[PDB]
Amino acid sequence: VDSVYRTRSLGVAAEGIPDQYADGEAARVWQLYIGDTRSRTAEYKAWLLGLLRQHGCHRVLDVACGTGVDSIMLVEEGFSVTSVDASDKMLKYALKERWNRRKEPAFDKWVIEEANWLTLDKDVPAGDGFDAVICLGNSFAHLPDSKGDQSEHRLALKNIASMVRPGGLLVIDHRNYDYILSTGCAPPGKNIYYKSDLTKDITTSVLTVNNKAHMVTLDYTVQVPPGFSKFRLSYYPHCLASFTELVQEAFGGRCQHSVLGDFKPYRPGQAYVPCYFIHVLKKTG
Amino acid sequence: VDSVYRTRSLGVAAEGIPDQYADGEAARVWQLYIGDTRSRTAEYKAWLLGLLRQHGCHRVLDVACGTGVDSIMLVEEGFSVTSVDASDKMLKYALKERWNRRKEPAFDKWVIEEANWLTLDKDVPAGDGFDAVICLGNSFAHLPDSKGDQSEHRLALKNIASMVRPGGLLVIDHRNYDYILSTGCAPPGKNIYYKSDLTKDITTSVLTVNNKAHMVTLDYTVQVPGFSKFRLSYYPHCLASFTELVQEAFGGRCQHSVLGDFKPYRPGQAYVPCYFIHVLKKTG
Amino acid sequence: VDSVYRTRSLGVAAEGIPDQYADGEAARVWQLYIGDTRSRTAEYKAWLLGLLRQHGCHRVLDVACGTGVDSIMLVEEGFSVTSVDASDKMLKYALKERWNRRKEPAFDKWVIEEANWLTLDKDVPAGDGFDAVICLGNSFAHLPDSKGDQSEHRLALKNIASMVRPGGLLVIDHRNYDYILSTGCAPPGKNIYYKSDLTKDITTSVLTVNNKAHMVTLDYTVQVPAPGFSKFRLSYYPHCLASFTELVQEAFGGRCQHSVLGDFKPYRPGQAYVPCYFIHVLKKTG
Amino acid sequence: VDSVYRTRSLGVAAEGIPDQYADGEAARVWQLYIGDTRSRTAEYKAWLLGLLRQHGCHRVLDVACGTGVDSIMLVEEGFSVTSVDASDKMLKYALKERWNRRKEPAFDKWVIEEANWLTLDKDVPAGDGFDAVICLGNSFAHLPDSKGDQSEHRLALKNIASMVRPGGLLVIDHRNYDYILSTGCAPPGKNIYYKSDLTKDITTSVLTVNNKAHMVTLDYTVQVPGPGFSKFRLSYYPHCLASFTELVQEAFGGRCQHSVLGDFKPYRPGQAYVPCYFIHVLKKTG
């Protein structure tokens, strides 16, 4: 009596017709957001290249490839890059760029494949390991805690760590959600990796479940040719002391750990409130 | 009071997490369905190559690329192929095959891009037009009549025909929906193009609105342990209506002939075909 | 990652806020639809009154009460009426009539209660059974074949039949779906029971699953103050005459006399006149 | 290509089938919840009667009638009661109870009707108003702030206040969301009005938007032999004291005397006892 009937199952597609909600207004502005990646900051490039070079890294795994934009810098600079992502919609962009650039030998050797943190050990044979694994741009916080005990967080971080060769590097970040939770507000424009060209106004919604922070949901209203349209994304608010604990546990404690606040050294109680924390772990070996 | 809160907008994605429903039970069985194209029939191949060679075709546009399997055959047999689809999810597979095979010069020159029939003129640069344009496997029927008057069907066909050079070819098919509507059932295993290896149980639902057929919806049950289901829907194009629609896309300025399962179709013939294939030659 | 989250559970309510979708536009036009009962046809009232008095019935159970319009005539005419529906939203209108009219002794004695066909034996005490059980206005057709073997239709009918005393009557109707399946079209304003005052356009959608009729879905479009249009949707199971003749007798184990009427007159198969409704009159000899 | 097909519009019903989601599990457990009122605390009754007898009240409007339980006590105690709710589903049970007791004239005179705080002006004939208007049980908090500016809250209160006769009372409560927001947890079984017989485990979700509390959503889990667990969800606007104090005064344009109670006893700011409910009692200047 109350049942509803779909024309096609959730998740299925067909020749000649766009995929489900592919062409909606939220999707359209979201696409402008993920493309707002044209200006890589000098300090980002200089910091990452410096840290990879300082450790002699050659073989790099990017486990949050997205559109490829972090991985493309490394390809251009002569690293042997493998890049993976669980999201096909985002990988589509990385693959397209690689295809356009395929006559450049460095791009012909760029590996791009579907993989999920939760199955990474299977989806990507480690061999002996990578020299560096990177997970930057606050991508780790895209994974929610839908079971309630952060067991998925721990599995994902363990699998990401298992990709690092002994003596190798993991570099993994999060936005400063300690500040977001204390103020209730996640302001726009602060991406330290790519300088934003897109003008965005953000509403921040924080869900607390029995007094424990559970989700941060950001509603973006983006001015476009004029025009004025909205999309929504959500994030797990990782706080610094928990993530410090988690990321070291993923290695069995067999790691040296340090934390940066926006590319610079971080020490508690410093005047400067970083936008992002960047954890750097050298696995024992 | 009655509102629901989403975690993310319809159609958006994020690094590190699978796209919406992409790992569901439906998507997983559907993937086996779209993958069932390992045994291309000898008749399909020999027919299509013959038609293209008899008309001297070299530049080919595939407007329903999907996983690329129709295109791959033409790429291997020496044609210059451009393949488009509105569906990134299916295009993903064609793109992967091109990349795996990229060291073959033929595959290096295979052009694959996203394009929608409703905006094809804008999405697909046509130069002076293609020698042949193909839309096979009953892909056209994927497009519904949302407006009610079949105006989208007309626009899609106009735009697909606009890709044809004067003197060129369009080859476009549909399943025999005359027969399916008369029986109420669309049985499995009848694909004339690719010999199925997957066993499917199909339930067929036909919706008729004010006595005009409007949608054929198929529920497929396949073994994957584990019977899983997925649903797809189809506009049930009948032969007389489609013949008129396809000629009207050219403005009447075309020669038109109909085949049934690769052979000329003679109305009154005993055999009732599983597919009708329309072969058009544009004036010029 | 794909989860949605509700402000309140499906089905639930709270003081000071309207019930889920209760104030929607579709709901508001549908309320006009179900209120379109100010004009009981004389032919109707004459036929049912005459059929009940012919069989000397006094204790009557209406199993599709609704807003109560059918039961109300009977109440006015001095029957002892028990009226039952599975839908509380509908039952609400009947209750409200009973309350306005409560100082009339007949309305004081009218029983109105919720009950479901599918659990009717438990939901209603029958005693030895009612002299007549009535299910009119094409309400039976409201129950879909969700399982696909019509097991629920047989259960509903079995339970409705068990409410009739021995030598008692079941009067149960259905619109003429043979006709509707043959033209694909359910024409508007044919209600033989209440002449309709509300003008609506209807779109008829028929779903056949594996060549068997499964559902008829009607979209009703009604005019509103550039003046606008608002629609609502209701769906029905398309009972054909042959099948239903089988099902309704089966519900008594074949221990019944059965006749079919077409729009209150005797139906003869092959007759030229094509009825809007078929009413099955069954007398339990059993 | 991505469309769905409903069987029936949102909000609509049909004879012989249950209303939408009416028989779901969440809805079943929730019926036990709103039914958990067999045990009015002796202290509530004494307090409210004392209060109303004190001011000489006779005609009382309950603007959050629900199942009728606040209002039934008042009918029993010889008040002239009009009870309203926007929820037809809760109101069902109040109307059931009046019918059941109609042979007592006090209940024959009890007026029960549907009305919404946001259109209360129209939905109730005010006359020169009521001696007292009660909105108790934390019902007001059921109204969300969907426009973002509390304009619905203001309209709702202003309309409630207009029902009060010159020199009459408004008595309106809210749970202590100051406390719930500080701890993040809504303790179960603290209803000061009716003692819970029913054991529920509560999860409390607080949504904050741009650092402003917007919504508290309670998930209620109850036990069922077979023992397994079943839940339902309700949501509330977290009114803080200082805010609600301002809003309730504004509803009368300040032409009122206001005092606040904490669990039936006078509230003295800074007191060590943290109350479960704040009850605001206002006398209209007139």
Ligand SMILES: CN1c2c(nc(N)[nH]c2=O)NC[C@@H]1CNc1ccc(C(=O)N[C@@H](CCC(=O)O)C(=O)O)cc1
């Ligand atoms: C409809 N929503 C809504 C709105 N704001 C406005 N203006 N209107 C609305 O309708 N925001 C909140 C509300 C819905 N409320 C809620 C409350 C709690 C949870 C909740 O349980 N949320 C978790 C799920 C936990 C999990 O399974 O991991 C969540 O992630 O949101 C969800 C929605």
Ligand SMILES: CN1c2c(nc(N)[nH]c2=O)NC[C@@H]1CNc1ccc(C(=O)N[C@@H](CCC(=O)O)C(=O)O)cc1
């Ligand atoms: C098989 N294609 C083709 C042809 N005709 C010629 N001579 N060559 C071809 O490759 N006719 C049919 C078809 C048309 N294809 C195309 C492909 C690309 C562009 C095009 O892109 N033209 C650009 C330059 C490059 C670019 O846009 O990226 C332009 O600016 O005009 C046009 C027509």
Ligand SMILES: CN1c2c(nc(N)[nH]c2=O)NC[C@@H]1CNc1ccc(C(=O)N[C@@H](CCC(=O)O)C(=O)O)cc1
């Ligand atoms: C979205 N719907 C839609 C429309 N028409 C238009 N113009 N636009 C639309 O989006 N009508 C059909 C379509 C959906 N298609 C279908 C296809 C099959 C079934 C189907 O299975 N229907 C039965 C269910 C069987 C049961 O569970 O008992 C049904 O009752 O509809 C439903 C809808």
Ligand SMILES: CN1c2c(nc(N)[nH]c2=O)NC[C@@H]1CNc1ccc(C(=O)N[C@@H](CCC(=O)O)C(=O)O)cc1
């Ligand atoms: C956590 N407290 C508490 C609760 N219940 C609720 N709802 N709120 C609460 O804060 N239950 C237990 C405890 C009760 N607190 C109190 C606080 C003061 C007085 C009170 O008025 N006490 C006397 C005695 C003072 C003394 O001995 O010093 C007084 O008049 O001060 C009573 C209970």
